[PDB]
Amino acid sequence: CSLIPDYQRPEAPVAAAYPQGQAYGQNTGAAAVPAADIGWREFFRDPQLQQLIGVALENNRDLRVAALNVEAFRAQYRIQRADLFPRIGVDGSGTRQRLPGDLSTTGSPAISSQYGVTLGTTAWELDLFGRLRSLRDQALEQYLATEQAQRSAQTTLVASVATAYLTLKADQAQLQLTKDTLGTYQKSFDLTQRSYDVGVASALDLRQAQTAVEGARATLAQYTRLVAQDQNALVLLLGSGIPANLPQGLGLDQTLLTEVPAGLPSDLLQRRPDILEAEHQLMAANASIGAARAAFFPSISLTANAGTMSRQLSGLFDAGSGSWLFQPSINLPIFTAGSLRASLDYAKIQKDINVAQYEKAIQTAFQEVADGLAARGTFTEQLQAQRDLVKASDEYYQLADKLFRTGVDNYGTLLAAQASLFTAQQQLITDRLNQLTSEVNLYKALGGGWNQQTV
Amino acid sequence: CSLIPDYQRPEAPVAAAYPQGQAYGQNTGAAAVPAADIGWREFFRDPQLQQLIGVALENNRDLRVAALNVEAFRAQYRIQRADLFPRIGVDGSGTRQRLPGDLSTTGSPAISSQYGVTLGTTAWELDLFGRLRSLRDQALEQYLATEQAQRSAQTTLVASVATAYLTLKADQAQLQLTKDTLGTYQKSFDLTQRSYDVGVASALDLRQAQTAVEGARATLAQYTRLVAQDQNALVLLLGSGIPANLPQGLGLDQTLLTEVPAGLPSDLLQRRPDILEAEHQLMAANASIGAARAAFFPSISLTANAGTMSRQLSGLFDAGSGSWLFQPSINLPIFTAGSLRASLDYAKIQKDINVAQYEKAIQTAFQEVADGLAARGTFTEQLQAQRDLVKASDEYYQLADKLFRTGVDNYGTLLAAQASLFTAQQQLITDRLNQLTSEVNLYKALGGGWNQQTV
Amino acid sequence: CSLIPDYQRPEAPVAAAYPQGQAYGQNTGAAAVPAADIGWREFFRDPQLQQLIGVALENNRDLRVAALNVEAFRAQYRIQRADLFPRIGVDGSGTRQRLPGDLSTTGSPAISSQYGVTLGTTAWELDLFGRLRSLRDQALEQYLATEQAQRSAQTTLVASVATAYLTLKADQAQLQLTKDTLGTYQKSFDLTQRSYDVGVASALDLRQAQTAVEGARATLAQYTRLVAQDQNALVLLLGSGIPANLPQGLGLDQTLLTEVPAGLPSDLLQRRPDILEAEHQLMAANASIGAARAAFFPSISLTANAGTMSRQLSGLFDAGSGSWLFQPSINLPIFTAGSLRASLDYAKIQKDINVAQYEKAIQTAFQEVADGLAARGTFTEQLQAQRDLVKASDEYYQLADKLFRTGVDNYGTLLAAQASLFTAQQQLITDRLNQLTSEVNLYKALGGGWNQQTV
Ligand SMILES: CCCCCCCCO[C@@H]1O[C@H](CO)[C@@H](O)[C@H](O)[C@H]1O
Ligand SMILES: CCCCCCCCO[C@@H]1O[C@H](CO)[C@@H](O)[C@H](O)[C@H]1O
Ligand SMILES: CCCCCCCCO[C@@H]1O[C@H](CO)[C@@H](O)[C@H](O)[C@H]1O
Ligand SMILES: CCCCCCCCO[C@@H]1O[C@H](CO)[C@@H](O)[C@H](O)[C@H]1O
Ligand SMILES: CCCCCCCCO[C@@H]1O[C@H](CO)[C@@H](O)[C@H](O)[C@H]1O
Ligand SMILES: CCCCCCCCO[C@@H]1O[C@H](CO)[C@@H](O)[C@H](O)[C@H]1O
Structure with a gap:
């Protein structure tokens, strides 16, 4: 039999639909292709990102450990499943003992002997009330949870890997922008030095150009280091060189991702891996509850063998030395100071813990998908505003430069326009990187990329 | 008996009083109400924050797991406490075996049988030297540690929850400030466009106003996203919608907290939960030391039953088939290659590990409370200076605007004043948020809010 | 015998040499003194940093726990090594039972008794096929891994500790710089107030000076808090006051570290502690594989004792009551539904997991050392550029101040120069701190400072 209680999946303690507001677009609803x-x-x-993701899938050591854990839990489940059948082996036993007079069968001190070679099972637990079967089902659910974890x-x-790739590309773009701005600043400083050496353009402008050049140089060194370290991090994530x-990769200013549907929050209960992992852990706790209650009921053991036995070692395997043993045993616990009840309470408490953890996994998935949706709703406007800011800064810088080639304006306004343009372009690159990272993380939260091709 | 050593709480490896300096106010000393x-x-x-904290206490799943762990460790302690009493059950045993001639009692191959149904205990460990009692005390101290952990x-x-609430409120304030500044910038840009279309106000001012508008728009989108994500994080922390x-909540510019006394560092040894958790873990290790030494002394086992026995199955429960068994056993280890000594060394080492962890918990509590006190001592001055900076920036902006409505000054100085005012107000909101968060974390470090009302 | 497979250290899945590029200097190659x-x-x-590191080594509680774990794993290994030898003890057994007529030796219900006091071993596992020895070797390798972890x-x-010391020193430098700049701003504001009260210098300049003063004051409070909290963190890391x-410490502008060689990536396989920890864990898994296969082969048990036995309690220790028991047992598993095979699969899977973790430790070490090398290659240029930026900002500020003491220029340009100089000096301090921290972390990644003096 089986004393495992019925499993009822808990209700999702999240809202029926994703949040709405000034940052969220209209809810798309149920998705055809989730x-x-x-x-x-x-x-x-x-x-190139696809090939890098493939290299990472084939060489990343953390994913290798996550895949090997599934094999280990499969082996553990197979052990627990084997625990049901009798362990049949060959038992070779010998006994030789001296007994005093009052204990020996002859009345005087005597040396008795007894030898046997038999085949059979010792203390086989007949799983009549489903204790070992409940443990096996617990192991099976833990294995399924390990698969979901993989x-x-x-x-x-x-x-x-996608985040590391996009971060490396964004920092390379920043490094190239810094190269260009530093070259412009160095050209301007050389022209200002030529001017200063012939009495024109006071030291103030020369020191201003020098400050700009040195700032650009420091930023150049910083971004060089950042690019090198991003490459290092990508190599570490790949697990290989x-x-x-x-192949030829696409630039940040191109369409890098396909817009992924949000679906309903109920899709997380069937599509997100860690939620199914928590659910399988909960079902394992349920099977453990079954195994714990199986302890109140009678336990049946069987010791059964057949072989040869003799008083002499020379009498082994002689005709007529055959023997067999059949030993059934039934035990029924009557008084266990609170022990079985406390074990059952522990099992129930563990199931409640797994219920709470499953519910919290659902809630965390909802929160992450809602953050991804807010990012999707706001990053378009933010990137458009940053585009327009960079455009207007470029127009202002061109106007200041045209008013500086004519004696109209001075050098400080031109340098301020250049600095504002540089910072605006930096912030544009950063906002593009953040939008792409948010979309990647939303893709991971909704279900990730477990499948290589679309199913 | 009991071989558990005496427990002596280690001295607090922290200073007698909290640190003093340019960032710390005068030490208040011992607090009447800690x-x-x-x-x-x-x-x-x-x-509203109180109601949200209540909803979180009643619905947060992490706190639910932390409370269920106390139940689980209580069940484990009850199991260990039950392990002391004899396990009395009904044993039904059957034996039927064929023996060869030289081993049977008849001289020829014979099939012997024997059946019994008895009530009693098997291998009951008489806890004479307090091994099971020491294990039970270890389980009890681990349960108390789990309660402190809850x-x-x-x-x-x-x-x-308080930090998430205050962060959401601060980001909403930032969003409203950005709305106001963007509206001002858009009004100014529309006026500058009207001026530019009639020959007045050169393109330079128009491009400047456009840059300001686009920057404000990007910041608006960013703060909208941040507010949405803060709401998501608050919902996740609440565990419910x-x-x-x-109720009507209070604004950031109001008094949100009651100033909490610092007390003495010795108050942490009795008022902070994780320190008591470490102390209970230490006492559990002490009880484990007791259980480990109980192994050198003689162990006493008892197998005692009474019931019916017979040679035939039909002879069971017949008058005269009564039987009883009393089997005491005493074992004394003489030679254990180093095994018992190494187990005792392991127990002592575990107690030393728990001592070190308790001391480190004390030190971490001291460090966190000292950081909170430094924050309390410096944030008042920082917020006052930021208040005065915002005030002076407002005065400067008003003077520039009055010198711009008169042809006196130009547009660039006015826009720079506006930008400085906006950044000053942003930093003021951020400093208020940081002060409130530091005070909340100091409250948590000193003892937290385990009690709903003041005891 | 021993069924442990041969151990072959896996090839390092990293590049033969450290990365090269615009951020990396030339590879130094094999180092004489690693x-x-x-x-x-x-x-x-x-x-002073050396004395602080010594105080931390002698008082830090985390290092104390890490050192005690080595003792605990040594004790566990000693237990597993003791498990090989027979456990010889004194067994005192008594038996008194009533048997019915059909089971007693007299034909009628009779009370039989039997007492014995013996010395010997019970169920000693003769480690013929190296199961207990394989478990002992696994425990030994786990102990070696714990030592490497320490x-x-x-x-x-x-x-x-070095990072905390350098961060505290850098924040103290920032606090002193803020003190100086705030004093300068307050002097300038007092002079501007004196000027404003006598009609000279319009309110605009007064409000500008006030904004500068308030900003400097807020930064002063912030850096005071940061210095206090850095001192708290240093005290926590030291584990003592x-x-x-x-001794007299050295300033940030001095040479604080000796340039450490990078060596080859193959040096990490023999010099980095956590890599050797992973290797010892792998060898422990190998020994566990050996123990698991030892289960397919025959197991040998021995129960051997000698002492006194009698039917009466008064007959104990009487002459002629001597007795001895020699009971060998040999078991050979024949049918284990998949159980032994699944256990062996689990052992192999655990060895593969340890292989993957060892390889990932190698890869992580390579990545960290490569980041340290990129920092070493770029921070010199970045700090030189920041030096030149601070120098040029100082020159520009002096020129603006000399053009302001003469009626030439106004107050706003002077204040902007002052602000740029202050920010440049702040960034210089920050870059120095980051360079020092990167070099310290590279030293830790290459091998750390396990030795006090150079070996
Ligand atoms: C011979 C049959 C005796 C059965 C005695 C059961 C003693 C009470 O044990 C009960 O067993 C259940 C399992 O079905 C558990 O789920 C219950 O919580 C437990 O109280
Ligand atoms: C020789 C002892 C005979 C059995 C008497 C043991 C009585 C133990 O009493 C036990 O106390 C626990 C709580 O204290 C309860 O939870 C158990 O239900 C109860 O059996
Ligand atoms: C019949 C009594 C024999 C007792 C032999 C004890 C062998 C030495 O064992 C001792 O036992 C102590 C427990 O009291 C431990 O705390 C000691 O560290 C241990 O060395
Ligand atoms: C048949 C074997 C008879 C017993 C002899 C076993 C001797 C084992 O010697 C053991 O070595 C350990 C360290 O090596 C010590 O810690 C133990 O105290 C010691 O008993
Ligand atoms: C009496 C000798 C019987 C040995 C039967 C071995 C049954 C197969 O067991 C084998 O044992 C090996 C250990 O050497 C393992 O490494 C193998 O993987 C396993 O398949
Ligand atoms: C009374 C039962 C007699 C023994 C028959 C048990 C047959 C169990 O079959 C087992 O199934 C497993 C997978 O399902 C396999 O891995 C095992 O090799 C196989 O022994």
Whole structure:
């Protein structure tokens, strides 16, 4: 039999729909092709990024450990499943003992002997009330949870590799922008030095140009270091070296991702890996509850063997030395100071803990997807405003430069316009990077890229 | 008996008083009503924040798991306490075996049988030297440590909910400030466009106003996203949806907290939950030391039953088939290659580890409270200086605007004054948020809000 | 015998040499004195920092726990090593039972008794196929891994203490710079107030000076708090109070560290502690594999004792009551539904997990050392550019001040120059701190300071 209680999946303690407001667009509703089914080969349009994600999937050591844990829990489940059948082996027993007079069968001190070679099982637990079967089902649910954990680990690895790639590309763009601005500042400083050496353009302008040049140089060194360290982080995430014949990657100013649907919050209960991991852990706790109650009921043991026995060692395997033993045992606990009841309470408490953790996983998934949706709703406006800011700063800088080539305006306003333009372009690169990272993390939260191609 | 060593609480490896310096006010000394006794209903003056903290206490899943762990460790302690009494059950045993001639009692191959149904205990460990009792005391101290951990978890949850609430309110204030500044910039840009279309006010001023407008727009989008995500984080911390009929909350510019006394560092040894958790873990290690030494002394086992026995199955429960078994056993370890000594060394080492962890908990509490006191000592001056900076920036902006409505000054100085005022107000909001968060974290470090009302 | 497989250290899945590029200098190659052998007494030139690192090594509680874990794992290994030898003890057994007629030797209900006091071993497992020896070797490798973990913990503690010291010193430098700039701003504001009260210098300049003063005041309060909290963090890392008679420390503008060689990436396989920890864990998993396969082969048990036995209690220790028991047992598993095979699969999977974790430790070490090398290659240029920026800002500020003491220029340009100089000096202090922290972390990654003096 089985004393495992019925499993009822708890209600999702989240809102029926994703949040709405000044930062959220209209709820799209139920999705035909959910986010978890959109393969990462189609979500990420950059072919070099796709090849890097493949190299990471095949070489990342953390994902390797996450995949091997599934094998380990499968082996543990197979052990627990084997625990049901009798362990049949060959038992070779010998006994030789001296007994005093009052204990020996002859009345005087005597040396008795007894030898046996038998085949059979010792203390086999007949699982009549489903204790070992409940433990086996618990192990099976823990294995399924480990499999879901491996899927979640793959989604996390894909998201992290994409984030590292985009961060390296953004820092390379920043480094190139700093190169260009430093070259412009150095050209301007050389012209101002030529002017200063012939009495024109006071030291003030020369010192101003020198400050600009040195600031650009420091930023150049900083961004060089950042690019090198981003490459290091990408190599670490890949688990292997960067291939030499990578395809041509797409720039930040291009469409890098396919817009992924949000779906309903109920899609997380069936599509997000860690939620299913928590659910399988809950079902494992349920099976453990079953195993714990199986302890109140009678336990049945069987010791059964057949073979040869003799008083002499020379009498072993002789005709007529055959023997067999059949020993059933039934035990029924009557008084366990509170012990079985406390164990059952512990099992119930563990199931409640898994319920709470499953509910919190649902809530965390909801929060992360809602943050991703807020990012999707606001980053378009923020990037458009930053585009317009960079454009207007460029127009202002061009007007100041045209009013400076004519004696109209001075050098300080021109340098201020240059600095504002540089900072605006930096912030534009940063906002692009943040938008892309937010979309990648939303893709990971909705279901990730467990599938390579769209199913 | 009991071989558990005496417990002596280690001296607090911290200073007798909290640090003093340019950032710390005068030490208040011993507090009449300590910080841990001040309820969170009285520490937090915002009624909406109080209702949110209540909803979080009743719905947060992490606190639910922390409370269920106390139940689980209570069940484990009850199991260990039950382990002391004999496990009395009904044993039904059967035996049927064929023996060869030289081993059977008849001289020829014979099939012997034996059946019994008895009531009693098997291998009951008479806890004469306090091994099981020491294990039970270890389980009890671990349960008390779990209870202290639940209290610490509640304090952490209260602090986190308050921090999320204050962060959401501060970002909403930032969003409103950005709305106002963007409206001002748009009005100014429209006036400058009207002027530019009639020959007055050169393109330079128009491009300047456009840059200001676009920057304000980007900041607006950013703060909208931040407010949405802060609401998401608050909802996650609550474990439930935000109620609709919440009371009227207080603004950041109002008195939100009651100033909490610092007390002496010795108050942490009796009022902070995680320190008591570490202390209970240490006492559990002490009881484990007792259980480990109980192994060198003689162990006593008892197998005692009474019931019916027979050679035939039909002879069971017949008159005259009564039987009883009394089997005492005493074992004394003589030679254990180093095994018992190494186990005792392991127990002593575990107690030393718990001592070190208790001392480090004390030190961490001291460091956190000292950081909170430095924040209390410096944030008043910083906020006053920021108030005066915002005031002087407003005066400068008004003077520039009055010198711009008259042809006196130009547009660039006015826009620079506006930008400085906006940044000063942003920094004022940020400093208010940081002061409030520091005070909340100091309240959590001193003892938290385990009590709802002041005891 | 021993069924443990051969151990082959996996190839390092990292590049043969450290990365090269615009941020990396030329690879130095194999180092005569590797980084791990350079003692921290010689790496850190600040004598006060050396004394603080010593106080931390002697008083930090985390390092104390890391050292006690080595003792605990040594005790566990000693237990596993003791498990090989027979446990010889004194067994005192008594038996008194009533048997019915059909089971007693007299044909009628009879009370039989039997007492014995013997010395010997019970169920001693003759480790013929190396199961207990494999478990002992696994425990030994886990102990060696714990020792390597203690070494890694010491390196981490040294790096953290150095980082805290340098951060406190940098924030103190920032606080002094803010003091000086605030004093200058207050002097200028007092002069501007004197001027304004006599009709000279319009309110605009007065409000400008007031804004500067208030900003400097707020920054002063902030840096005071930061210095106090850095001192708190240093005290926490030390595990004890700061000594009063510390030696004279060196300033940030001095040479604080000795340039440490990078060596080859192959040096990490023999010099970095956590990599050796992972390797010892892998060898422990190998020994566990050996123990798991030892289960397929015959197990041998021995129950052997000698002492006195009698039917009466008065017959104990009487002449002629001597007795001895020799009971060998041999078991050979024949049918284990998949159980032994699944356990062996689990052992192999655990060894593969340890292989993957060892490889990932190697990769992480490579990434951290490469980041340190990029920092070493770029921070010199960045600090030189920041030096030149501070110098040019000082020259520009002096020119503006000389053009302001003469009626030439106004107050706004002078204040802007002052603000730029202050920010440049702040960034210089920050860049110095970051360079020093990067070099300290590179020293920790290459091998740390496990040795006090250079070996
Ligand atoms: C011979 C049958 C004796 C059964 C005695 C059961 C003693 C009470 O044990 C009960 O067993 C249940 C399992 O079905 C548990 O779920 C209950 O919580 C527990 O109280
Ligand atoms: C020789 C002892 C005979 C059995 C008497 C043991 C009585 C133990 O009493 C036990 O106390 C616990 C709480 O204290 C309860 O939870 C248990 O239900 C109860 O059995
Ligand atoms: C019959 C009594 C025999 C007792 C032999 C004890 C062997 C030495 O064992 C001792 O036991 C102590 C427990 O009291 C431990 O605390 C000691 O550290 C341990 O060395
Ligand atoms: C058949 C074996 C008879 C017993 C002899 C076993 C001797 C084991 O010697 C053991 O070595 C350990 C360290 O090596 C010590 O810590 C133990 O105190 C010591 O008993
Ligand atoms: C009496 C000897 C019987 C040995 C039967 C071994 C059954 C197969 O067991 C084998 O044992 C090996 C250990 O050497 C393992 O490494 C193998 O993977 C396992 O398949
Ligand atoms: C009374 C039962 C007699 C023994 C028959 C038990 C048959 C169990 O079959 C087992 O199934 C497993 C997978 O399902 C396999 O891995 C095992 O190799 C196999 O032994």
